C-alpha cells in the first residue's frame, strides 16, 4: 500500500478542443485493439498498489498511466495533439518495464502489447 494516489486526471474544461483524424484513429482504432487483447486487463486500469500490497510502487513510478485513462482522455478531448496520446502510452509501457524485472510475465504481456501498437502507430493516418 499503503494508499492509492487518485487516477490521473481525464478532463480539463479549460483545455481547447479539437478532433482531427489521427485522434479519432487512436481511440477507435488503437486504443480499441489494444483494449480487446487477451493480455490487456492489468493495463486497463490504473495499478492497485493496495490490493497487490506493492507500497513501493508509486515510490518508484511518479507519472503512472493505463488505457482506461488514455480512453477518458480521448473522449473528452484532453489531447491537442495525437503526440501527447502517444506519450502516455510509451509511459504506461515505460512504467512496467521500469517497476518489474525483464522477463516477468506482466513485462512480456506490456511487451505483447507494445508490438501491436507500435504496429498500429506505424499505420497511423496522415493529418488532414
Ligand atoms: C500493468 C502493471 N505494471 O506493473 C504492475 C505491477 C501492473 C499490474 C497492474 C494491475 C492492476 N491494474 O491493478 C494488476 C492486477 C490486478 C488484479 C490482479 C488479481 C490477481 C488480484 O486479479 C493481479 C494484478 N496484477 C499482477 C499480474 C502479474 C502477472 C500477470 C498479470 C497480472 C497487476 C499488475
Not at 499503503?2 to 478542443?17: D, L, R, V, Y
Not at 483494449?35 to 493496495?50: E, T
Not at 495525437?82 to 506519450?87: D, F, G, K, V, Y
Amino acid at each position: 500500500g499503503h494508499m492509492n494516489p487518485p487516477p490521473p486526471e481525464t478532463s480539463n474544461p479549460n483545455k481547447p478542443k479539437r478532433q482531427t483524424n489521427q485522434l479519432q484513429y487512436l481511440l477507435r482504432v488503437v486504443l480499441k485493439t489494444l483494449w480487446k487483447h487477451q493480455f490487456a486487463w492489468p493495463f486497463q486500469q490504473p495499478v492497485d498498489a493496495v490490493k497487490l500490497n506493492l507500497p513501493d510502487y508509486y515510490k518508484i513510478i511518479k507519472t503512472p498511466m493505463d488505457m482506461g485513462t488514455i480512453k477518458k482522455r480521448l473522449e473528452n478531448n484532453y489531447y491537442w495533439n495525437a503526440q501527447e496520446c502517444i506519450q502516455d502510452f510509451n509511459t504506461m509501457f515505460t512504467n512496467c518495464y521500469i517497476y518489474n524485472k525483464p522477463g516477468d510475465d506482466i513485462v512480456l504481456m506490456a511487451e505483447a502489447l507494445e508490438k501491436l501498437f507500435l504496429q498500429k502507430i506505424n499505420e497511423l493516418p496522415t493529418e488532414e
